[PDB]
């Protein structure tokens with residue numbers, strides 16, 4: 001049922017009066033096209049994050065970056081906490097990062113990229129999942145988990161991470 | 174269907190050696206407890222935002238605030254774009270904002286709160302939906318849509334927004 005709680009000093013105020021005073025001090029956040037940042041976006045509680053891509057740029061130089069493509073969700077503060085899981089199809093490495101809103105993320109000056117990775121992990125595996133280990137590894141500048149996963153795939157072609165890009169392109173054609 | 178793409182200059186590079194060079198230039202974003210902000214969080218593309226609460230503070234005075242409770246989803250860049258929909262149950266008003274991560278949002282010095290609003294809209298209604306008009310209204314310092322909705326609820330009690338909080342509380346007991 002509809003209910004109202006209030007500090008007792010507002011007992012004799014009308015609802016209209018109160019909301020007029022609240023709005024007066026609040027002002028206008030100007031949540032409009034071209035004007036939305038973290039200062040006026042507001043925020044959500046209780047939710048997870050999802051998307052066909054996750055991307056991040058270096059804080060050391062703000063240029064070096066990677067883009068993970070697939071079907072990913074991140075539990076954020078839901079349990080198991082701070083777990084990335086789902087399907088990791090692709091990984092692009094290079095300099096500069098554009099898009100991410102009404103267009104996909106893209107590396108501006110691409111070096112190298114991998115497609116058809118076919119890596120997946122369940123929510124319940126938590127931080128032990130391969131997708132989480134790979135992507136979080138890369139956020140921390142640690143390629144070890146990625147290289148272990150790539151060695152697993154490349155094993156089918158008699159290759160490894162010590163193979164060159166030309167060798168890998170030759171066997172996977 | 175594993176594949177690779179690369180700038181021709183990396184043809185004779187080993188995968189291992191490329192990733193070594195990428196990682197040593199990327200560094201470590203330091204995505205750890207207490208050290209995560211927007212500068213080192215990364216981002217997702219193609220996704221939606223949801224939660225049991227939405228909340229926001231004034232950009233002018235950094236204090237006046239509200240918290241909307243219920244079951245909410247915001248389409249973000251998915252169509253119909255920038256639409257808040259679902260069920261709106263509660264709305265609390267006052268000064269200060271606490272929590273939002275591992276605890277619910279809460280107003281620090283509450284003035285007034287409304288429960289059992291029982292308002293709901295669909296994604297397909299877009300910006301015409303009542304949950305969107307109410308909350309976007311409040312974000313714009315514009316209580317008009319809220320007051321229309323409250324007059325609807327209150328007319329079944331023979332009251333309106335010009336009634337006092339004591340009178341509303343008496344009728345809704």
Ligand code: HEM
Pocket residue numbers: 031032033034035036041042043044222227247255256257305308309
């Ligand atoms: C949940 C309550 C929210 C509502 C009702 C809402 C509604 C809107 C509306 C109606 C617009 C554009 C229409 C205009 O120009 O008048 C807009 C823009 C935008 N909002 Fe929201 N929004 C909400 C929360 C958020 C959140 C949590 C974010 C996350 C960062 C966000 C990000 C954006 C962005 C990036 C834009 C447009 C930027 C641009 O196109 O230049 N909004 N919002």
Ligand code: HEM
Pocket residue numbers: 049054074082083084127132135136204205206207208209210214215216217
């Ligand atoms: C998508 C890939 C991501 C992965 C794999 C990831 C992983 C992690 C991990 C493992 C932790 C805990 C590490 C520790 O205990 O030191 C953490 C903390 C955190 N992450 Fe993420 N994260 C990702 C993206 C994001 C995003 C998009 C946000 C949203 C802004 C975010 C916000 C946070 C916050 C606020 C904390 C810690 C806050 C605290 O307890 O002090 N992360 N993340």
